[PDB]
Design an enzyme around this catalytic site. Sequence first.
Site, PDB file in Angstrom:
ATOM      1  N   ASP A  11       0.789  -1.222   0.000  1.00  0.00           N
ATOM      2  CA  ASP A  11       0.000   0.000   0.000  1.00  0.00           C
ATOM      3  C   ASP A  11       0.817   1.264   0.000  1.00  0.00           C
ATOM      4  O   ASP A  11       1.808   1.363   0.711  1.00  0.00           O
ATOM      5  CB  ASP A  11      -0.967   0.045   1.176  1.00  0.00           C
ATOM      6  CG  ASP A  11      -2.216   0.910   0.882  1.00  0.00           C
ATOM      7  OD1 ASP A  11      -3.082   0.484   0.036  1.00  0.00           O
ATOM      8  OD2 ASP A  11      -2.326   2.003   1.505  1.00  0.00           O
TER       9      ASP A  11
ATOM     10  N   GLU B 211       9.605  11.278 -11.308  1.00  0.00           N
ATOM     11  CA  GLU B 211       9.256  10.057 -12.030  1.00  0.00           C
ATOM     12  C   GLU B 211       9.861   8.813 -11.391  1.00  0.00           C
ATOM     13  O   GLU B 211       9.609   7.696 -11.819  1.00  0.00           O
ATOM     14  CB  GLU B 211       9.687  10.157 -13.492  1.00  0.00           C
ATOM     15  CG  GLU B 211       8.837  11.117 -14.323  1.00  0.00           C
ATOM     16  CD  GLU B 211       9.053  10.934 -15.812  1.00  0.00           C
ATOM     17  OE1 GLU B 211       9.070   9.760 -16.258  1.00  0.00           O
ATOM     18  OE2 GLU B 211       9.209  11.951 -16.531  1.00  0.00           O
TER      19      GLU B 211
ATOM     20  N   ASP C 227      -4.466  -3.113  -2.649  1.00  0.00           N
ATOM     21  CA  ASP C 227      -5.797  -2.525  -2.485  1.00  0.00           C
ATOM     22  C   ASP C 227      -5.984  -1.332  -3.457  1.00  0.00           C
ATOM     23  O   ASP C 227      -6.255  -0.224  -3.050  1.00  0.00           O
ATOM     24  CB  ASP C 227      -5.983  -2.117  -1.006  1.00  0.00           C
ATOM     25  CG  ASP C 227      -7.406  -1.601  -0.677  1.00  0.00           C
ATOM     26  OD1 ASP C 227      -8.353  -1.941  -1.414  1.00  0.00           O
ATOM     27  OD2 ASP C 227      -7.583  -0.858   0.323  1.00  0.00           O
TER      28      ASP C 227
ATOM     29  N   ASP D  78      -4.663   0.569   3.827  1.00  0.00           N
ATOM     30  CA  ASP D  78      -4.972   1.886   3.349  1.00  0.00           C
ATOM     31  C   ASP D  78      -5.176   2.893   4.493  1.00  0.00           C
ATOM     32  O   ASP D  78      -4.756   4.036   4.376  1.00  0.00           O
ATOM     33  CB  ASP D  78      -6.168   1.876   2.417  1.00  0.00           C
ATOM     34  CG  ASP D  78      -6.529   3.287   1.916  1.00  0.00           C
ATOM     35  OD1 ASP D  78      -7.039   4.142   2.703  1.00  0.00           O
ATOM     36  OD2 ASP D  78      -6.300   3.551   0.723  1.00  0.00           O
TER      37      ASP D  78
END
EC number: 3.1.26.-
Length: 704
Positions: free
Chosen positions: A500, A539, A569, A681
């Site tokens: 996550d 990036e 997730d 999360d």
Amino acid sequence: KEALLNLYRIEYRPKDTTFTVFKPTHEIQKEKLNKVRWRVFLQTGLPTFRREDEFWCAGKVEKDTLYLTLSNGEIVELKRVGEEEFRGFQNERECQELFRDFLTKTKVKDKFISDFYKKFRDKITVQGKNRKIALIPEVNEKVLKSEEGYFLLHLDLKFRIQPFETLQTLLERNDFNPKRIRVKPIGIDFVGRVQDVFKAKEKGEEFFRLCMERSTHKSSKKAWEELLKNRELREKAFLVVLEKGYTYPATILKPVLTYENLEDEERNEVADIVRMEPGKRLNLIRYILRRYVKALRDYGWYISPEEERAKGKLNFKDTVLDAKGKNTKVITNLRKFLELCRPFVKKDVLSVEIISVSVYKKLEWRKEEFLKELINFLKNKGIKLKIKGKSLILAQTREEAKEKLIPVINKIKDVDLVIVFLEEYPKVDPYKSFLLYDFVKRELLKKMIPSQVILNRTLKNENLKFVLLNVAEQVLAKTGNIPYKLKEIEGKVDAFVGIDISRITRDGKTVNAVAFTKIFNSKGELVRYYLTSYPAFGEKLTEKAIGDVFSLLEKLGFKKGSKIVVHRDGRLYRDEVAAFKKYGELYGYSLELLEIIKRNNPRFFSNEKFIKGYFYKLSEDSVILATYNQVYEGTHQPIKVRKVYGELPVEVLCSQILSLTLMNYSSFQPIKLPATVHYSDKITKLMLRGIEPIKKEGDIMYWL
RNA sequence: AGACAGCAUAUAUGCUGUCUUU
RNA sequence: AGACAGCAUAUAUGCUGUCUUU
């Protein structure tokens, strides 16, 4: 054992097959594409889908140019290629677009929300002391592709809960420091969090000229017109800026409240309606569909009248054992299992810190008795809780409590556990809506200290032994005493990796970022977690963080040729897949990449209560999977699992996912997500605010 | 004290339209 | 069902003209 889904076969085969196509004059930047398309529909008036760089109009169009200003005042120009004959669709996305546009053109969805009010208007508004409340039906369509290649209309009905209190009124007549609360403009679909407020009196004549000319909706356009013309209204008007920097007046904006953040009395009245018998809902869904079919056949749309069906159930390794070797052989009582079960003890003595929050002074008994009968139980399993200390906070609002809880939680150092008995605070300012359990939960997670939070309601409603068990199961896990392990998970995976990542953002650039990774063995014991934050990498963030997980794997020394499964997730993007491919090689592991989308999936409607394992198979190795069984209170929503790459069959990966479910260590309460990514999360998100660097690892599921 | 019309206010009413619910 | 707009209308009371009543 028959399970229907709100998914309906659909195709487009009209007699007129003649579109007018348009091509940009300067390659369109990607996140500008949906805004152009939409803008094309308005102008043209005709339904429209994006095929590649080109734009297809379900009608003849004799204007050889199309100029389309976006909100920035930026003009995208499209040259007209010419008529082409629609042989068919290349993907759900084109299909979805055109179909929605056709709803819009025909007004069915509209005529429907109208009829529904005319009918149930009265039963839809609801009181409760001071505020008043609406629950407004929301119809939603998406288009998906099944395994066999059919396109599928995904058709749902929900209710969004909203007050009668326009933002203007709240900031003007009432408040102090609003914000954070999410919103929905009258007459506009989009819904989202607030991220900036200023008075309108700042802006000159131009600024509302410009918003008027551009705003793509009648309600937004009318509203900016008002503030153009009515001379002093700009002083009085305040202006909001949402999540997707959309910027609207205040009078246009209303809040969308969740279930949770309503009152006790409100919620139970509201509840009858928001959550509703599956059959009822499916009867409505069918109702809406018939409207649709009748509005659209004449234009060549063909929608199966019949729901799609669960392809079956999947069996997974649900067999689980303790430090003796006791099995699913007992598991014919999950409760009877946890009583007798004898946990894997790696911390003989526990030190516990006790927080009780209540309204009065000599009424700790229910909580003293519990705490007692539970020291008991834990001792009979080789574990002594030393109480390092209690703190009894007296408090009369959630607000007062929160406030006192702060210096208390603040000071807690060095404990294996915090137990919090919270009393229930019935009401509170409808904006200032914290959840007390949440708050306490947040503060302690921040600290990395396992916690068990016990609501006084629970002691009052629920039987001592029931509550005893639920808590004991987690408290054990939390502390590293895993009250049982899995025998096996299908496949020959050697590691299971939850991934996550959340990132704060400014202008349009990744600024702060917190990553949270949790590695489990082939049996699905947790091996280590890593709670890491990154500062700005343009990036390079993705490469960086992905690699970090790989090296960490080598640092635990998983031998080359070891299979490693990854769960996230959330939508993994292309740049990430290519990232996992790179290190896939460079480390030399066979990798299975899984993307789990948990929100808004098609539902299963069915008589069987024991749905866990039911599934359906879409295009591109993705699977509507149901993980928990039906509760009556709850609204069951299955998860969407998608094999982004790898040598195993998704149904095997889904089986795995079902197994890991049990590693959440929460027999009594359904948990949608597998242990790999469960709460991940919340954790990442929670830490993001955490002013300052973070590097932690551990081997204890502190977050349960 | 009366019938016409034209104006004044109040109350109450019937239809259409918009938005609340694009 | 309610709020705003646009039309239609009833009833009460006076108001200015107007017939009659010369």
